[PDB]
């Protein structure tokens, strides 16, 4: 269990937490604003998934400051997580390419 597989695994777990908490915080922030469609938990969870994966169909979109602020956190946490995995996959491939040589 090296670092790159530990961080990537921890990123996946953290991403799940952000998706769940993001759904809760989105509804809590979007309600009270007339015209907002992100006001129920199940679809807010679906919105979080297509937000963290960047994607963004447009069927659901935050219209409040805190609702959009939550979205930004979801985006970054999504991009970083899916990006931390790629960096982990590279370290795996690089470390094995040395084994196909003299290291």
């Amino acid at each position, epitope marked *: 269990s090296a670092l790159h597989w530990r961080a990537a695994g921890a990123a996946t777990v953290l991403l799940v937490i952000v998706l769940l908490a993001g759904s809760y915080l989105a509804v*809590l922030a979007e309600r009270g604003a007339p015209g907002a*469609q992100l006001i129920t938990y199940p679809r807010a969870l679906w919105w979080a998934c297509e937000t963290a994966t960047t994607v963004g169909y447009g069927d659901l979109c935050p219209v409040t400051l805190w609702g959009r602020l939550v979205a930004v956190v979801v985006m970054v946490a999504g991009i970083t997580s899916f990006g931390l995995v790629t960096a982990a996959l590279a370290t795996w491939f690089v470390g094995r390419e040395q084994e196909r040589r003299g290291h």
Partner: antibody
Amino acid sequence: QVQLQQPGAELVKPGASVKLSCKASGYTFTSDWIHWVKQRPGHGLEWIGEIIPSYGRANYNEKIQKKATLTADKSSSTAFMQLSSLTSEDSAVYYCARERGDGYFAVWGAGTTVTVSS
Amino acid sequence: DILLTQSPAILSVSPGERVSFSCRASQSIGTDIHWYQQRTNGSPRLLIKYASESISGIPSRFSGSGSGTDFTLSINSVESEDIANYYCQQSNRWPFTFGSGTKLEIKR
């Protein structure tokens, strides 16, 4: 079991105030929203406002005159609606309902018949 | 705010006949509409959630359909205990709104 409990009636004279209660039972999640619905005799349902006991945040209907204050109490699982400075137009039956956060009102209360007179 | 129009206000029907209630939204709300029932001096009771999804406890007599702006609550062969006020409620955009209501009466 009766999930939502409300007082039978509340008599208020114009200018005064009243604090209705909505003691809830059954499954109490963290995503539960307590709504309040006003219904005048002969008329239909009217959404007053909503509140989430978990966070304490409350939203209200903006199209009508705002004279309601929603507070909660997680210790006793009871929602409270504070009506201030009422007139004859505010005399109606006030229902409270529980929403699981999925849009619809699963269960309603018996409703509190608030009468405004001297 | 989304406006929900229920027409007609009073719906008269013979016993054992199929009756359909109407609910029209001022804008497309998908299937985020919900039907309720309120008898004389009673509390509203959920009949149909999300346009067509049925509720446990509610008789199979009730059914729902529609998508977008037009929705319909139907009762296959209406009986005496179905005499009440029927309201529709949307949950697509904040705030939640109700319909004007529709009175059902039986011509015995």
